[PDB]
C-alpha cells in the first residue's frame, strides 16, 4: 500500500509506483530516528547504498513486507535481520548490466594501451614515448569467466575489436554461449590460452580466489587482468605477486574486498588501473535500476 | 643500394628481411646531427621512424644517398622539398598503423565515457570519489566521425558494437559506401547538432586544420565530447580550450598537437582533458607491420 523511497531516485520509480495504485514518501539523508519515523505505516522501503538498513531499522519498522534496492550491492542491508523478520530483499542487477559490461571493455582497451598512466605522465609535463609502447587487441585471446548477462555484452564487443572470446560458466550451457560467439573449455583448459582474463560471477565460496597463485601459474606469462564484478574474485595478495615477477602485465580494478582498499599496494601499483566501483556509476544505469525496482513492487 | 643505416628503433624484422634481400645493416640510436651524417657517408638508404630528423642539412652532406624509407604513416621528419632536389625516393607505410590507431581512438572514447584516467589519478591519489564521479552510458548514444577512410571506418565498426548510432561526413566516400560500413553520411552542418561524441579521422590539410574551431563547437549539442588521435591542428587547440572552459566541451582525449612535446600546457593540464604522448602507432604489433612494410620496399628496389 505505502513505499518509502529514502535515497536520491529518478522520478520513474515513483511514478511507475504511483500507476501501480501505490502511496509513494520521497525523502532524502534521513536520520536513523526520521527513517524509523517515516516506516511506521510503510509495507515497503526503496533504497540506493546511502540508506542503512540495518537491524534496529527493520526491528522497529513492523508493518516492512520488502526492502528494494536500485541497483547491485546490497551491503547497506542487513540480509540476516531482514530473513529473522520473514522480509524479502530485491535488487536489480539486470539495469547496470550495461553500463558494468561498457567499464569492462574500457579497462581492457587501458590495459592493453596505458591511457590513465600515459595521462598522469603527460600532466606531469613528460612526454614518455618508449614506456608507454603498448599491444594491438586484435587476434588476441580473452578469457571470460562468468557467461551471464555482463559476460555475454563483453563478448560481443570485444569480439568487434578482433579478440578470441573463450570462457567457461557452470551454470550456461556450451550451446547458449556459441550463440554469442564464446567457445567454452574446461577452466584448465582456459589459463594458459589467454592474454586477457575478465570476470563476471557473484562472489560465492566457489569464485572466491578463482584468480589465485595456482591458476595465475598456470596463466601465460604477461597476462592482463580485469576486476569489474566483486572484490575477492581475485586473490589480491596473489594478484599484487604475480604483478611483482611480470605473470600478471597488468590489472584493472574496479572492485576491492575491502571498500575503500586499507592496503594500497595493487592501487599503487604502476601496472594496475583503478577507479572506486564505477561500473554502475552512470545517469543511464541509475535510471534503470530505478525503473526496474519500481516494475518488481 | 648495397648498405642501409636504421638510425631509430625498429622492430627487428627490419634489419633481417633488409640482410635477406642482399643488404649490408648498420643499427643505430639518438644520433646527434654529426653523428648521423657521419654514419650516411657510406649509406645509399637510410630508415627512420620519428626521431631522427632526415633535414635539408642531412640530404645535402649525404653523397651518396638514394632513398629515406619511414616506418610509419606520413613523413613529418623528411624534408621532402630537400630529397625532390637531390633526386632521393621517399618511401614510408601508409596502413601500417591502422587497427592500432582506431583501437586507441576507442580507448579514449570510453576513457571520456567514465573518467577512467580521472578515477585512477583519484585512487592513487588515497582518494574514494565514488559520489563525484558521473559516467556516460554508450548504448544509444550518437558518435560523429569526420573522415571516412580506413581508420574511421575501423572505429565505426567496433563502436557500433556498443550500440552507438555511428554518423559522419567525408567527401571522397560516397554514403552509399558509407552505409556499407554502417556509416550514415549527412551534410556537414547536420553532423555537428547530433553528436554525444565526435572523432577526427582525416589528413591534415588547409581545409581540415580547424575543422573543429569556434564557430563549428557552437553548433554541437552542449556537453560534447572529442577525440583526436589523428593530427595535430585538425581540433583548433584554442578553441577546444575556449568550449572546455564554457562547458560547451564536456571532455577531449588528445594523441596529437600542434606542437609535439607541447609547450602550452593549457589543455593538457585541463582537468577534462585525457591525453598521450602521440601513442597512435606504438604497438609492438603496428611497429613489426611498419618495420617489415619498409623493408620489404627496399628490397623491391633492390
Ligand atoms: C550465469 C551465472 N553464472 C554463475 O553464477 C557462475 C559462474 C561461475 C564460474 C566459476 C568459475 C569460472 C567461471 C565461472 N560460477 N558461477 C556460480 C551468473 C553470472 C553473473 C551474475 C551476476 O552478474 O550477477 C549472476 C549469475
Ligand atoms: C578517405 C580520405 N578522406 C579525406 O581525405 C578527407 C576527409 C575530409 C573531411 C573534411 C571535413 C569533414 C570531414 C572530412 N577531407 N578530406 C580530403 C582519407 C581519410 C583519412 C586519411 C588518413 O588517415 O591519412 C587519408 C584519406
Same mark, same amino acid.
Given at each position: 500500500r505505502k513505499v518509502l523511497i529514502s535515497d536520491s531516485l529518478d522520478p520513474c520509480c515513483r511514478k511507475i509506483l504511483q500507476d501501480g495504485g501505490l502511496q509513494v514518501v520521497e525523502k532524502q539523508n534521513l536520520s536513523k530516528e526520521e527513517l524509523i519515523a517515516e516506516l511506521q505505516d510503510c509495507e515497503g522501503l526503496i533504497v540506493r547504498s546511502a540508506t542503512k538498513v540495518t537491524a534496529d531499522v527493520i526491528n522497529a519498522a513492523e508493518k516492512l513486507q520488502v526492502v528494494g534496492r536500485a541497483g547491485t550491492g546490497v551491503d547497506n542491508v542487513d540480509l540476516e535481520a531482514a530473513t529473522r523478520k520473514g522480509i524479502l530483499v530485491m535488487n536489480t542487477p539486470n539495469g547496470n548490466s550495461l553500463s558494468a559490461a561498457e567499464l569492462t571493455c574500457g579497462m581492457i582497451m587501458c590495459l592493453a594501451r596505458q591511457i590513465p598512466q600515459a595521462t598522469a605522465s603527460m600532466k606531469d609535463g613528460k612526454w614518455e614515448r618508449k614506456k608507454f609502447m603498448g599491444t594491438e587487441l586484435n587476434g588476441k585471446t580473452? /578469457? @571470460?569467466?562468468?557467461? *551471464?548477462?555482463?559476460? !555475454?555484452?563483453?563478448?560481443?564487443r570485444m569480439q568487434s575489436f578482433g579478440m578470441k572470446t573463450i570462457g567457461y560458466d557452470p551454470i550456461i550451457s556450451p550451446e547458449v554461449?556459441?550463440?554469442?560467439?564464446?567457445?567454452?573449455?574446461?577452466?584448465?583448459?582456459?589459463?594458459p590460452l589467454c592474454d586477457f582474463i575478465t570476470v563476471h560471477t557473484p562472489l560465492l565460496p566457489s569464485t572466491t580466489g578463482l584468480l589465485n597463485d595456482n591458476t595465475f601459474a598456470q596463466c601465460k606469462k604477461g597476462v592482463r587482468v580485469?576486476?569489474?564484478?566483486?572484490? /575477492? @574474485?581475485?586473490?589480491? *595478495?596473489?594478484?599484487? !605477486?604475480?604483478?611483482?615477477?611480470?605473470?600478471?602485465?597488468?590489472?584493472?580494478?574496479?572492485?576491492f574486498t575491502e571498500?575503500?582498499?586499507?592496503?594500497?599496494?595493487?592501487?599503487?601499483?604502476?601496472?594496475?588501473?583503478?577507479?572506486?566501483?564505477?561500473?554502475?556509476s552512470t545517469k543511464e544505469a541509475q535510471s534503470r535500476c530505478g525503473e526496474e525496482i519500481a516494475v518488481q513492487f
Open positions: 580473452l /578469457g @571470460i569467466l562468468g557467461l *551471464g548477462r555482463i559476460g !555475454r555484452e563483453v563478448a560481443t554461449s556459441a550463440s554469442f560467439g564464446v567457445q567454452q573449455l574446461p577452466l584448465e583448459e582456459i589459463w580485469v576486476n569489474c564484478a566483486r572484490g /575477492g @574474485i581475485v586473490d589480491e *595478495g596473489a594478484l599484487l !605477486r604475480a604483478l611483482q615477477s611480470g605473470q600478471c602485465a597488468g590489472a584493472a580494478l574496479d572492485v571498500e575503500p582498499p586499507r592496503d594500497r599496494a595493487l592501487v599503487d601499483h604502476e601496472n594496475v588501473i583503478s577507479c572506486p566501483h564505477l561500473g554502475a
